[PDB]
């Protein structure tokens, strides 16, 4: 949805991918090699969101062995498509925070209803399944094979973050990218690319405040085509768009981006319900942008600073949003009916939002009560939780996970008029620890997926006398309150009580096996290095000869910092065997000994309070946006490809600053022409 | 640390001049810190070092600039103690210069304060990762001075004589390189904007002086903050000390071609001066 | 064209006129008496522009084509009677006829006059349309026609007892709606003026909307027939156009938050009106980048909104410009010049694309960059950069004078009778810089005699109406001013759509030599011609039964007083009355129009039942612009619905009740209850 609006408003941030063909070396039918220059522009790091590959949908291979080879072939293509030169980060979702459990729980329970009507496995992707255990080792073999069987992979690392590592896909990427900035030696002009399908990536890409960033995905509106998504171009758009005049404080686009990213979460995210007066398809983002620009000159400070809210400022933001509820609601009701007679002339009811006083009907019906004190108590509780959610999410995208146990205790969002006197509210978080995968499996898998769950825990999920059977209803109410039937249906389900859930699950771990117990413990990411790589002599000399338990790192040839720990399970003389049985129709993968690569436990630098400002010594690229492009942004209001992709995307030029006014070099060019 | 946003924010350089501080020229010009460093290094070594000349960077910079920038006069004191040379300014001449500074107008005071303020803006007490917003934003409020500073002592040598001098370091580019500190050192000075040919000429003279400064210390990079007549920063330009002679020689707008390169002549003059100093005094003598 | 935008942007301004005939009063559908209550709300004054009635050519859809002047006279009488009947005034009726227009005006319609002559020549290879001009004998017949109708209506109709009629014939200098504007300002300077006077202008030009807001009389409206339903014998519908409601809209629309000075909707409207004059007016060519069809008014309004918080004062104040303020306004517009020109290029070719599926050399290419240079030598045929810089800067100076001249002309009367725009085109908005350097001054001068104005706007093909003596000076090939009258002239298409909106390039009349030749022929004119070539004063006609009638006779006819300051009266008219020497107390007035059958023959009436006095207004005063004391606001027509739809509507361009109760001054308090008022506290609970 948001992708279509981004394409419409910003055309230049999308470009096709030059997949080329077999012949690239000046004709004569020369097959491509990994060392050939990339027509798409050189790239340093590439981060993979493995969900987009492990769950391609497109409803099909029936056995794991059929698709693992397809996964390897598909991933080989995209890596060849972009050709990272320094690092490859592979991220597989771990246990997500409690906040996303409820959103994930609703998605799975809806799929249970989908199966029932189909009666008139795609659920094994969740962490903790035996398929995850098989998949995790599958990646390790693929990484080793590519490094040892390719001349072009000499100086490229592979970092594996499987389901064992806690945290979700993008969060793993976000934490690592920030950790690179914590090292003072970090090279500012490091170029990044990330592959994924989720629409949050555009926002999360701007959170790093690294201009040399880009996002890779296939063409939704289309060999499968792929589309580049250059964020540095997008920064040029936002810098021009979000520079309002008449300011009492100096302009700072770095803080503006944080504000702009912030408001793009009220319109919609995956942790809190959208506001009743807001909808992305209704261009609600432009509504907030116009409001935010209008009110900003009055205030003295920005809405947020490094992921921390300014409660008096944000309370002002949505204050006049309350002034636009009635117009918005009447617009929907007028337009909803008006479309009905359009087809008729040619060849919900409980609240009646268009009519005034909707606030009373909305809370009364949605809560099955009409006591004003009860409504007053509930409505005030609604705001305090919601502001915490916004506070929690904004921290979650700037400072890692701030709370592993927080969740939203209601199914609906309060009206924008309700948020008053927010400064009196007190916000506090407790980080806690992420749940074990088996606990996460029970919290999100529906009643129709006991097979994925361990057989011991199957009883506690479907037993009529199970102490958590109330958490597992076969049939659930569907509060429609939406378009027509199911598009935004709310699966009204009781929120899982941790104390009831945690007490029961911990009483069943004893009768499990060591393979399951090992599969129910958190781990740390691993790193594999090539034999010809520069660090190969260094790490072995220290982690295998000097007997060092651990060895610190800094910015190096790879560009990866952190802490290295020797992998006990790793054997110097061992040989890796492809866990998937070698099928037919694909390239045979020979076993490889450990004499050509090293596997070491990996860690990141200690967490630090990140600052959302551009680093020093940075070099900016050129600019697509010309005067005509700029003019269509300021005065355009509302409205309805391969040149320079080698010397333009990267950090063009060698000067950090720009030649302006009285600069000596700037004097030369202006007086050179004249 | 200085992003482009601050450059576009039109930072003032005249604010705080009424809180400006100035130290004691005679006290600061003393070779005492270098003497402490020599005492320490001899303590680890246990024997007198092979260094022959001990002095400050400013005197040698003046000596280099002498054949082509002789707009000032000076008096220097030379003491050959223990067979090693020691060069410092003349205390009566220090008093004379202080009297001249008393006679100097507020223009020089404002300009030097603006220079120190610009140094304050583009510097951080801690490396960028471990700073906080409070440190970054409150830079303009901290009062500047000319007493606390960081200096470095370098060993060099011309012809056949080893030279051991010291000098102040403005700041480091990204951090401290314990294996090659000179590589990451950065020097900062200010200048007026450039609009006419006289502007290029004066700027080139300043470039020559600063090149002497850094190249004597071996500083690779030099940065200027271009301020207007209103003490407002306008632009910032970067240079490398090796590129300076080429940039001056290869200037496309050099309406007056330089038939002779002044850099080699200045270095030859400095070598001749060093030989003269090493030869003229024998031991336990004081000259001027 | 503007009226379409007003209709689509402000919906509730328009309301149909309740055309009631033979009302069933007490069960009897007898004809409505003039004294019967008006279903359209009671009205006090009524100002009539004779241009909107005496123009058969303006409405050629039907077949009027009156062969004899008598037909026109009687049709005019019937139409005026109908319009007054549906208007129903109670105090004053003002009748206005165009006079000798200011020098800055006839240069416009002189191009319009030649277009008829240009088309007539081509069509050739019905009455004379050009005969509707001051100085013709037709008005001399029409001037007497009005007076007889005024006398007959007063002396017979019982309801017209308290009415007073003021007639300003073509002899009185001044443009039509300018006279109404000047007269209303004269009523403003009387301290005894009633703040709650309800006015109404019957006009056809769209400029009346702005001229209505200039007065700052909230109780105001304009009577106009349905333009959009007349095209798509039976009684023509008419549209009430309540200005007081438009005051409600602009108050919400122009209330930009966050200002360094207190908000003043009264002051804002003058800025809003002044903006609506760049987009187009009869005196100055429109700006190249400004088109009313392109909604340029909204373009300026948005620009005016952002430029306002920084600017410490309003653009205009009581008809005077603030040159530093306006300069900033055009600077923001100067940035949009390139962008605006672009759409007019693509939308031009996009329109060209659509028709394909359904079935002075120009070439500037404004959409291409560098058009600013290419524009001038294309139009001025001079490649010298030095001349262009001098010419363009000088030609900008005239334009600023014009805007200054125009704005005064609608606020403080005519500032100059000799200024005119000496260029055929408007400069680019980017050219408006260093305005404060320019010096602005005017000379009042004196208006022309009607004969001088006749030849200066009439072409060489209509010398028949003009006196025969002067025909030699304008028709002979050896005339010293024959160059002023070319049979064929170059037409500048200027890249328009159709030829009828081109630019008829014509030379500018040299005033100094033109008058000198004309004054030589005065001595050969007849006495009747000389009298018709003399400016005069207005005429006030009062009925015998009127309350103020005995006072006039008591002084102007019994005490022998030469003048008498009328001041405010029962009818609200104020000014100076002078006895008419021509009028006879004991005489009888006869209709100078031959009677026509079936047109309700009007008997002659003696002078014993009415009075005619030469009328003068109060001395000119520097009128300010703010509402008067004691004013009672009307009941608000908007309840929080259009309030939202105008704040956030953005683009809303996609038969109701009587609404008569929303016209009069509802309530009696000058102020309104609010919050902590004692009456309000009682009212709330």
CB contact under 8 A, A327 and C648: yes
Beta strands in C186-242 (DSSP E): 201-202, 221-225, 238-242
CB contact under 8 A, C338 and A627: yes
Task: Give the integer Cα–Cα distance in Å for A208 and A170.
Answer: 12
Do B231 and B12 touch, CB atoms closer than 8 A?
A: yes
A545 C-beta neighbours (distance < 10 Å), count? 8
Task: Give the integer Cα–Cα distance in Å for A241 and A258.
Answer: 14
Chains with 3 or more CB pairs under 8 A to chain A: B, C
Cα radius of gyration (chain C): 27
Token couple for A452 = 């994925």
Task: Give the integer Cα–Cα distance in Å for A596 and A166.
Answer: 30
Using the CB atoms, write b or e for C543-573: b if 16+ within 10 Å: beebebbeebeeebeeeeeeebebeebebbb
Task: Give the integer Cα–Cα distance in Å for A18 and A81.
Answer: 8
After which residue numbers is chain A interrupted with C–N beyond 2.5 angstroms?
59, 120, 222, 347, 640
Chain C residues with CB-CB distance to A298 below 8 A: 258
Task: Give the integer Cα–Cα distance in Å for C412 and B111.
Answer: 58
Q: From the CA of A242, how many Å to the nearest CA of chain C? A: 15
C131 C-beta neighbours (distance < 10 Å), count? 15
Question: Residue ranges of the alpha helices (H) in A86-168?
Answer: 98-118, 130-148
Do A354 and A334 touch, CB atoms closer than 8 A?
A: yes
Task: Give the integer Cα–Cα distance in Å for B215 and B212.
Answer: 5
Smallest CA-to-CA distance from A143 within A456, A589, A522 is with A589
Determination method here?
cryo-EM
Q: Is A249 left (phi over 0), alpha (psi -120 to 50) or beta?
A: beta
Smallest CA-to-CA distance from B199 within B224, B222, B220, B221 is with B224
Smallest CA-to-CA distance from C613 within C638, C576, C560 is with C576
Q: What is the largest CA-CA distance in chain B?
A: 58
Chain A residues with CB-CB distance to B2 below 8 A: 616
CB contact under 8 A, B129 and A614: no
Q: From the CA of C623, how many Å to the nearest CA of chain A? A: 36
CB contact under 8 A, C339 and A632: yes
After which residue numbers is chain C interrupted with C–N beyond 2.5 angstroms?
125, 232, 359, 654
B203 touches A: beta carbon within 8 Å: yes
What are the Cα distances from residue C599, in Å, to A555, A582, C77, C145, C591? 105, 111, 10, 15, 13
Task: Give the integer Cα–Cα distance in Å for A235 and A207.
Answer: 12
Chain B residues with CB-CB distance to A655 below 8 A: 238
Task: Give the integer Cα–Cα distance in Å for B193 and B183.
Answer: 29
Per-residue DSSP letters for B232-281? BEEEEEEEETTHHHHHHHT-TT-SS--SS-HHHHHHHHHHHHHHHHHHH-
Task: Give the integer Cα–Cα distance in Å for B114 and B20.
Answer: 10
Task: Give the integer Cα–Cα distance in Å for C392 and C597.
Answer: 62
CB contact under 8 A, A657 and B235: yes
CB contact under 8 A, A324 and C648: yes
Torsion of CA C413, C419, C425, C427, to 10 degrees: -80
CB contact under 8 A, B129 and A183: yes
A253 touches B: beta carbon within 8 Å: yes
To one decimal, the resolution in angstroms is 3.8
- Interface-testing mutation among A283, A324, A631, with chain C (most C C-beta atoms within 10 A): A631
Nearest to B3 among A306, A608, A614 (CB): A614
From C645, which residue of chain A is nearest by alpha-carbon distance? A327
CB contact under 8 A, B253 and A657: no
Task: Work out the burial of residue C494: count CB atoms within 10 Å of its CB; fewer than 13 is exposed, 13-18 middle, 19 or more buried.
Answer: middle
A to B CB pairs, distance under 8 Å: 88
Task: Give the integer Cα–Cα distance in Å for C485 and C456.
Answer: 9
Token couple for C530 = 């000389």
Nearest to A666 among B5, B173, B235 (CB): B235
Task: Give the integer Cα–Cα distance in Å for A506 and C391.
Answer: 92
Smallest CA-to-CA distance from A566 within A602, A530, A595, A524 is with A602
Per-residue DSSP letters for C60-112? -SS----SSHHHHHHHHHHHHHHHHHHH--SSEEEEE---S--HHHHHHHHHH
Do C381 and C370 touch, CB atoms closer than 8 A?
A: no
What are the Cα distances from residue B280, in Å, to B84, B274, B275? 13, 10, 8
B193 touches A: beta carbon within 8 Å: yes
A616 touches B: beta carbon within 8 Å: yes
Q: What is the largest CA-CA distance in chain C?
A: 89
Question: Residue ranges of the alpha helices (H) in B168-222?
Answer: 181-184, 197-217
Smallest CA-to-CA distance from A521 within A401, A400, A404, A439 is with A439
């Amino acid at each position: 949805a948001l992708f279509r609006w981004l394409s419409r408003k910003y055309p230049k941030i999308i470009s096709p991918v030059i997949q080329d063909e077999d012949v690239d070396i000046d004709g004569e039918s020369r097959p491509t090699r990994y060392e050939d220059p990339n027509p798409n522009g050189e790239l340093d790091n590439l981060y993979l969101d493995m969900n987009g590959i492990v769950h391609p949908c497109s409803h099909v291979p029936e056995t794991e062995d059929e698709m693992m080879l397809d996964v390897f072939a598909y991933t080989e293509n995209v890596i060849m498509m972009a050709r990272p030169r320094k690092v490859i980060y592979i991220a597989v979702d771990g246990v997500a925070p409690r906040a996303k459990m409820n959103q994930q729980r609703s998605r799975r329970f809806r799929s249970a209803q989908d199966a029932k009507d189909a009666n008139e496995d795609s659920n094994a992707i969740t962490p903790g399944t035996p398929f995850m255990h098989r998949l995790a080792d599958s990646l390790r073999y693929w990484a080793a094979y590519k490094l040892t069987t390719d001349p072009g992979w000499s100086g490229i690392e592979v970092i594996i973050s499987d389901a064992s590592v806690p945290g979700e896909g993008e969060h793993k990427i976000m934490s690592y990218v920030r950790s690179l900035r914590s090292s003072p030696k970090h090279d500012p002009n490091t170029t990044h690319c990330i592959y994924g399908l989720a629409a949050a990536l555009i926002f999360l890409g701007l959170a790093t405040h690294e201009p040399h960033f880009k996002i890779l995905r296939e063409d939704v509106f289309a060999k499968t085509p792929f589309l580049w998504l250059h964020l540095n171009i997008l920064r040029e758009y936002l810098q021009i768009e979000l520079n309002v005049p008449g300011l009492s404080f100096p302009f700072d686009l770095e803080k503006s981006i944080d504000d702009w990213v912030f408001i793009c979460f009220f319109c919609g995210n995956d942790f809190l319900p959208h506001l009743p007066s807001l909808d992305v398809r209704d261009n609600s983002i432009t509504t907030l942008v116009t409001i935010w620009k209008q009110i900003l000159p009055t205030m003295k400070g920005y809405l947020t600073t490094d992921g921390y809210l300014n409660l008096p400022a944000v309370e002002r933001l949505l204050a006049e949003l309350a002034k636009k509820e009635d117009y918005i609601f009447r617009k929907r009701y007028e337009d909803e009916k008006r479309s009905l007679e359009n087809q008729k002339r040619r060849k919900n009811e409980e609240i009646r939002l268009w009519e005034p006083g909707y606030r009373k009907r909305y809370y009364e019906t949605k809560f099955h009560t009409k006591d004003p004190q009860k409504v007053k108590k509930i409505a005030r509780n609604m705001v305090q939780k919601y502001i915490e959610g916004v506070s929690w999410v904004l921290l979650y995208y700037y400072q890692g996970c701030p709370s592993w146990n927080w969740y939203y205790p209601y199914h609906y969002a309060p009206f924008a008029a309700d948020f008053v006197n927010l400064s009196e509210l007190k916000i506090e978080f407790v980080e806690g620890t992420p749940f074990r995968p088996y606990e996460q499996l029970m919290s999100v898998l529906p009643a129709a997926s006991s097979h994925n769950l361990p057989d011991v825990f199957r009883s506690l999920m479907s037993d009529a006398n199970s102490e958590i059977i109330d958490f597992y209803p076969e049939e659930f109410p569907l509060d429609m309150n939406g378009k027509k039937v199911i598009w935004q249906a709310i699966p009204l389900l009781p929120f899982i009580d941790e104390n009831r859930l945690l007490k029961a699950v911990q009483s069943k771990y004893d009768q499990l096996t060591e393979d399951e117990k090992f599969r129910n413990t958190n781990r740390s990411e691993i790193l594999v290095l090539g034999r010809s790589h520069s660090h190969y002599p260094t790490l072995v000399k220290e982690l295998y000869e000097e007997g060092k338990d651990s060895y610190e790192f800094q910015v190096d040839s790879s560009g990866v910092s952190g802490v290295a720990i020797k992998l006990q399970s790793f054997d110097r003389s061992g040989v890796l065997r492809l866990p998937v049985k070698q099928l037919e129709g694909y390239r045979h993968y020979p076993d490889i000994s450990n004499r050509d690569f090293l596997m070491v436990e990996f860690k990141q630098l200690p967490k630090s309070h990140a600052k959302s400002m551009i680093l020093s010594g940075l070099i900016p690229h050129l600019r697509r946006l010309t005067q005509e492009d700029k003019d269509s942004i300021l005065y355009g209001g509302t409205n309805f490809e391969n040149a320079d992709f080698k010397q333009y995307i990267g950090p063009h030029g060698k000067s950090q600053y720009l030649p302006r006014q009285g600069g000596y070099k700037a004097f030369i060019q202006i007086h050179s022409d004249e | 640390y200085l992003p482009d946003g601050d450059i576009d924010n039109s930072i003032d350089l005249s604010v705080g001049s009424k809180h400006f501080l100035l130290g004691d020229s005679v006290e600061l010009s003393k070779l005492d810190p270098i003497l402490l460093a020599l005492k320490e290094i001899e303590k680890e070594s246990g024997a007198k070092t092979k260094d022959r000349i001990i002095t400050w960077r400013g005197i040698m910079r003046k000596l280099l600039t002498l054949p082509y920038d002789s707009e000032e006069d000076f008096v220097l004191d030379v003491v050959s103690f223990d067979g090693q040379l020691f060069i410092q300014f003349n205390v009566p001449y220090l008093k004379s210069k202080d009297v001249q500074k008393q006679g100097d107008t507020e223009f020089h005071k404002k300009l030097q304060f603006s220079g120190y303020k610009f140094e304050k803006m583009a510097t951080l007490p801690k490396p960028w990762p471990e700073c906080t917003r409070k440190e970054i934003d409150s830079r303009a409020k901290s009062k500047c001075n000319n007493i606390e500073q960081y200096g470095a002592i370098v060993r060099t040598g011309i012809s056949r004589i080893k030279i051991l001098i010291g000098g102040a370091v403005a700041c480091t580019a990204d951090y401290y390189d314990e294996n090659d500190p000179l590589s990451r050192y950065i020097e900062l000075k200010t200048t007026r904007t450039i609009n006419q040919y006289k502007d290029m000429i004066a700027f080139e003279k300043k470039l020559f002086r600063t090149w002497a400064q850094c190249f004597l210390l071996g500083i690779p990079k030099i940065i200027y903050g271009f301020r207007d007549d209103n003490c407002i920063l306008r632009t910032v330009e970067e240079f490398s000390t090796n590129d300076i002679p080429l940039m001056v020689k290869n200037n496309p707008l050099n309406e007056q071609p330089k038939k002779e390169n002044c850099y080699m002549s200045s270095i030859n003059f400095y070598g001749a001066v060093v030989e003269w100093l090493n030869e003229s005094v024998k031991d336990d003598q004081v000259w001027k």
